[PDB]
Amino acid sequence: LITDQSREEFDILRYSTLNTNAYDYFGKTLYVYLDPAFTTNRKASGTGVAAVGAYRHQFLIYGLEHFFLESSEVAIAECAAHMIISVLSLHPYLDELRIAVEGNTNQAAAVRIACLIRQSVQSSTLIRVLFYHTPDQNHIEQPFYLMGRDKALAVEQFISRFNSGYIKASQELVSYTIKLSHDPIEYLLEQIQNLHRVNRISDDLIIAVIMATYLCDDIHAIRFRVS
Amino acid sequence: LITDQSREEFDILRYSTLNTNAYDYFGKTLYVYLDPAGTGVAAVGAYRHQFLIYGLEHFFLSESSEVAIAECAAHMIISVLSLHPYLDELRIAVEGNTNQAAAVRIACLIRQSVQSSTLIRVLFYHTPDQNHIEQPFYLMGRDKALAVEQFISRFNSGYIKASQELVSYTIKLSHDPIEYLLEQIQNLHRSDDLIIAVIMATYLCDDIHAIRFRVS
Ligand SMILES: [Mg+2]
Ligand SMILES: [Mg+2]
Ligand SMILES: [Mg+2]
């Protein structure tokens, strides 16, 4: 499934973006994805956030969060926003944000969360923010993304990119909810090992990386619109 | 000539070995080349089919130059070995163009300082001279052009990288060793004492040379 050489190179070969001021080859757009977590009542998992950008033909992971909880929606949005602001701060060449917020069962909450994220970001820094928009009932666009047939293409595309060296972490990777307990990349590797094609091995951060990387292509570029 | 993109990668993509604890596809051999007089020193080893640089010195010549030089090469080797305990053999080549005798005394001093500090297997490149007695020096001749060509081809392909935790006591801290090496890389065609040491050190990692290295 996943190569040993590719897992090992992802760990020991990370990009030190801070070592250079020559940005010609970096993508200027930060893609992020999150899947805010509610389920019912019980103590379950958390919420995966990932932030990625292009470098030549590669994709670079700038940020990871795996967040566990008063307003769940504010805590969630704030932890996404805080990661994004640090990332923008570390990589000034980044001049646009494109954000997808999964709303699969609870789309009202994903609406509000999108709106809260755009709020913290814009309070802190001047940048254009775009959200993945999808049609709803009376055919009106709403700032959410829906997982569906996509997930298989995305998973299968990740596995193939990772195996061939296309997925890389940066050295200055931001993670306020992981870094104090683990190297975030070692944590993310534990999940990459748990990957199958398509019952209690968490997979939330890895899917978030799979999806941020996936919505990178131009096939999705019109879906992103001012929220 | 070296490609623009290869130089950029070399700058922004460095090995961090301390993130791993497995080790099965490292070489456990540190290859060191120095050419005494500046005197350039480099230390490299393998990761799979590629190469990384663990240490670099460029060392400037009261007296006892030989002792001084040996102690400089030896200090970097100690530090590099001390930071990478999976490394368990040293293969050293001391270049001897014109002064075979001094290269031989420096080999012996380097061996002594390394073995007073740490338990490790230590081999030197050997060359037969006059009486066909195998001696611990290396003679550059016409192989130099060949080492420069392979290095250009490997560097352009991305096969040669620095380690994050690169040791240099002679260059490091008013200069970044990578920067200073990059300036030499940018500069040659067919002072450069440092990039020559890196070229020859990665050239001597091939299996074809393994049999010239012996316990001295
Ligand atoms: Mg630099
Ligand atoms: Mg969900
Ligand atoms: Mg690790």
Curated annotation (Swiss-Prot), chain A:
Annotated region described as Required for interaction with UL56 and DNA packaging, given as residue ranges: 148-168
Localization: Host nucleus
Positions of the catalytic residues: 35 (for nuclease activity), 102 (for nuclease activity), 204 (for nuclease activity)
Protein's job: Component of the molecular motor that translocates viral genomic DNA in empty capsid during DNA packaging. Forms a tripartite terminase complex together with TRM1 and TRM2 in the host cytoplasm. Once the complex reaches the host nucleus, it interacts with the capsid portal vertex. This portal forms a ring in which genomic DNA is translocated into the capsid. TRM3 carries an RNase H-like nuclease activity that plays an important role for the cleavage of concatemeric viral DNA into unit length genomes.
Assigned protein family: Belongs to the herpesviridae TRM3 protein family.
Known partners and oligomeric status: Interacts with the terminase subunits TRM1 and TRM2. Interacts with portal protein.
Name of the protein described by the UniProt record: Tripartite terminase subunit 3
